[PDB]
Design a protein around this ligand. Structure first.
Ligand SMILES: N#Cc1ccc(Nc2nc(N)cc(-n3ccc(CO)n3)n2)cc1
Length: 272
């Protein structure tokens, strides 16, 4: 990663928290193309100092994805590791993460918006699958909205997939259980089962979020009951707007080997 000096970064408002992290809007002073000086809006993602022992996984999350370049993958500018900080410096996305956007905007998101977003997520995942790169934490909180839909110019919304954060292969068991039903059953059984098929299951859970106005699937279940949901082999209820329910359930297959390729997922979306 490119190294960015702390002197060149200004922290502004908090934008929320992730697992062992806090996110802020900020500004980076930099020399850009043609030698022009810029003050660039950035997302600053800060590893909690109490959890500095996760720093390798925290950065590994950003690194492997940054090794590929793609229009639907978030841009990482660099890292700041001055002093006692562990900071990832990422492009600032104007409309934020999709979980929040969906909850705020339930009433004006229709089936065509959901389908376009699903197709774009599936394109990003097909790119990862073709490169045999595991993401490991597909969820609406890790989808960023670059551009809102504009009917008045026929313009679709445009999303990017952000980094997965610290890997489920190193996280505490109780955090994994709280992340059911994004973490697939085989990874609850053994987090080293993380595989390309993991991302197909989580993609189904993410489609359910997209279809459910920002609701969290199984939120009313505590961790014990989320575990038993897997033990009993349940599927999620169909969203009220159920156009994608079959695809969600086909992706959320308890047999990892039976989960469909992202090419087949795309063909299915294109058929609707
Ligand atoms: N109101 C408001 C508002 C909130 C956030 C943004 N911008 C943004 N830009 C990014 N590159 C990443 C994120 N994230 C948000 C959650 C995560 C965890 O994945 N990231 N948010 C813009 C407006």
């Amino acid at each position: 990663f490119h190294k960015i000096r702390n002197e060149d970064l200004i922290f502004n408002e908090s934008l929320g928290q992730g697992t062992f992290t806090k996110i802020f809007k900020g500004v980076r002073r930099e020399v850009g193309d043609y030698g022009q000086l810029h003050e660039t809006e950035v997302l600053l993602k800060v590893l909690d100092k109490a959890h500095r022992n996760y720093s390798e996984s925290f950065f590994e999350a950003a690194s492997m994805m940054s090794k590929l370049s793609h229009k639907h993958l978030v841009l990482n500018y660099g890292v700041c590791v001055c002093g006692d900080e562990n900071i990832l410096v990422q492009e600032f996305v104007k409309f934020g993460s999709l979980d929040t956007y969906l909850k705020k905007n339930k009433n004006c998101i229709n089936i065509l918006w959901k389908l376009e977003v699903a197709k774009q997520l599936a394109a990003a995942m097909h790119f990862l699958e073709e490169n045999t790169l595991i993401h490991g934490n597909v969820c609406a909180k890790n989808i960023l909205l670059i551009r809102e839909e504009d009917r008045k110019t026929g313009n679709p919304p445009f999303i990017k997939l952000s980094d997965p954060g610290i890997s489920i292969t190193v996280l505490p068991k109780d955090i994994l259980q709280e992340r059911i039903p994004w973490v697939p059953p085989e990874c609850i059984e053994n987090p080293k089962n993380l595989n390309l098929a993991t991302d197909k299951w989580s993609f189904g859970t993410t489609l359910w979020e997209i279809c459910s106005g920002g609701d969290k699937p199984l939120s009313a279940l505590d961790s014990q009951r989320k575990l038993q949901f897997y033990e009993d082999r349940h599927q999620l209820p169909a969203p009220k707007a159920a156009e994608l329910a079959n695809l969600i359930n086909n992706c959320m297959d308890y047999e990892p080997d039976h989960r469909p390729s992202f090419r087949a997922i795309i063909r299915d979306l294109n058929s609707l």
